[PDB]
Amino acid sequence: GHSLQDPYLNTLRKERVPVSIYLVNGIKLQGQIESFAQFVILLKNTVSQMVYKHAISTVVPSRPVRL
Amino acid sequence: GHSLQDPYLNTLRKERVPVSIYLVNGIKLQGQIESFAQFVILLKNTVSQMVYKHAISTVVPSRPVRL
Amino acid sequence: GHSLQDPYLNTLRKERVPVSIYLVNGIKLQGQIESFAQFVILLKNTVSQMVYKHAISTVVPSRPVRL
Amino acid sequence: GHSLQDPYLNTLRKERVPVSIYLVNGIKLQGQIESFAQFVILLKNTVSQMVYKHAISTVVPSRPVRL
Amino acid sequence: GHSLQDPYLNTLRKERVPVSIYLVNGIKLQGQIESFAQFVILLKNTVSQMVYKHAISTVVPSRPVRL
Amino acid sequence: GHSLQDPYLNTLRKERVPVSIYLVNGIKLQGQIESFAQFVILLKNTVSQMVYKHAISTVVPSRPVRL
Ligand SMILES: [Mg+2]
């Protein structure tokens, strides 16, 4: 219950909001959240890549989003 | 029970205290805690970004805060 | 239940899709997913090496794949 | 049960022993353990900052301490 | 159940296969898997050292191995 | 059950074997295992410091040890 991560990612996915996912190695990825589960997020643009959440620092939308 | 993280973050959120969140990659973020849950914190200023706690080193308020 | 990681990796394995596995240390590996379990993925080419998921940032297929 | 971390940190807190907390990013912090819980330690000096244990390498007291 | 890590490491141990264990800090170790458990692997050559799995990126055998 | 980490560390502690603990940040520590629990090891020499296991890569004894 009392989850914030699910509502957040689900909004970004539903509204097709472009995001930057900054990784713990300094790599910045860019795409749309196509899908997400317990341990991974699927980020689309050219191909859909599987990002491990443990590797993510911050999810930054290109636009403000509201829950 | 016996939690310290929840009371701490909830105070920073309630009192809108400006914080620095230092990440494990040396990146320093700055904003207000808008919201927080089990695995993430939502830090606001320009847009509300989702920070993974596993990526956080230290939360540093701009002012002393008391529990 | 509601898993996305298993369907994703199983597709890449079944269709023998070439992938890049980017590690949290900046190392890029390349091979085919031969096998995967709870904590590891087995990536084949010259020899089959065991990659720990906690060390993985992103799995990137050489081709789009559909679930 | 059979805990060593709690007795250790509680001693440092009770005796107000100055410590260095070395982080996994090479950052050295310095303060007094004001408080600690399951996932975080609160280190005081100028303001009380919340340090995530997953970000900590070693806790080093300025003086020997005994359990 | 459905484990792949145990069968893999147990084969390398049984057949005394020389391996490279690449760590998340870029350090490459070399030895034989003497033993392994839930959280650690014991790698032998000059002395038997205890490697934490959370620190391991990939296990790479010097020869192909089959399960 | 079927633990290898406990027997290993307990031997090093009992026999006062000098060890190098290599950390995931490249820092090499040196001391004697004074004590250990679920998440930490206490390494003695000048003062007894608390090392978090999640920060440890490998434990390397100065001498071979047998279980
Ligand atoms: Mg690092």
The enclosing domain of B16 has a CATH number of: 2.30.30.100
Report how far residue B32's alpha carbon sits from residue B15's, in angstroms, rounded to the nearest whole number.
9
Residues whose CB falls within 8 Å of the CB of residue C56, separated by 6 or more in sequence, listed in order: A52, A55, C21, C22, C23, C24, C41
Cβ–Cβ < 8 Å for B57, B49: no
Rounded to the nearest 10°, the torsion over CA D3, D8, D14, D18 is -160
Counted domains in chain B: 1
Residue A44 CB coordination number (10 Å): 15
Q: What is the least distance, in Å, from the CA of C15 to any CA of chain A? A: 15
Chain A residues lying within 8 Å of C9, measured CB to CB: 50
Q: What is the least distance, in Å, from the CA of E25 to any CA of chain F? A: 6
Q: Is the dihedral of CA B45, B50, B54, B55 positive or negative?
A: negative
Report how far residue D61's alpha carbon sits from residue F67's, in angstroms, rounded to the nearest whole number.
32
Counted residue by residue, chain E has a size of: 67
Residue matched to tokens 């298993």: C6
Copy the structure tokens of residue F58: 């490998």
The whole domain housing D35 covers 1-67
Contacts of C40-44 with C-beta under 8 Å, sequence gap 24+, read: C40/E4, C40/E5, C40/E8, C41/C9, C42/E4, C42/E8, C43/C19
Residue B23 CB coordination number (10 Å): 20
- Residue B28, strand partner residues: B22
Extended strands (E) in chain E:
18-23, 28-36, 40-44, 49-52, 56-61
Q: Alpha helix locations (H) across E1-67? A: 5-14
Helix (H) or strand (E) holding C11: helix C5-14
Extended strands (E) in chain C:
18-23, 28-36, 40-44, 49-52, 56-61
Instruction: Confirm or reject contact between C20 and chain A (CB < 8 A).
Output: no
Using DSSP bridges, classify how beta strands A18-23 and A56-61 pair: parallel, antiparallel or unpaired.
antiparallel
Judged by DSSP in three states, A37 sits in coil
Using the CB atoms, write b or e for C35-60: b if 16+ within 10 Å: bbbeebbbbeeeebbbbbbbbbbbbb
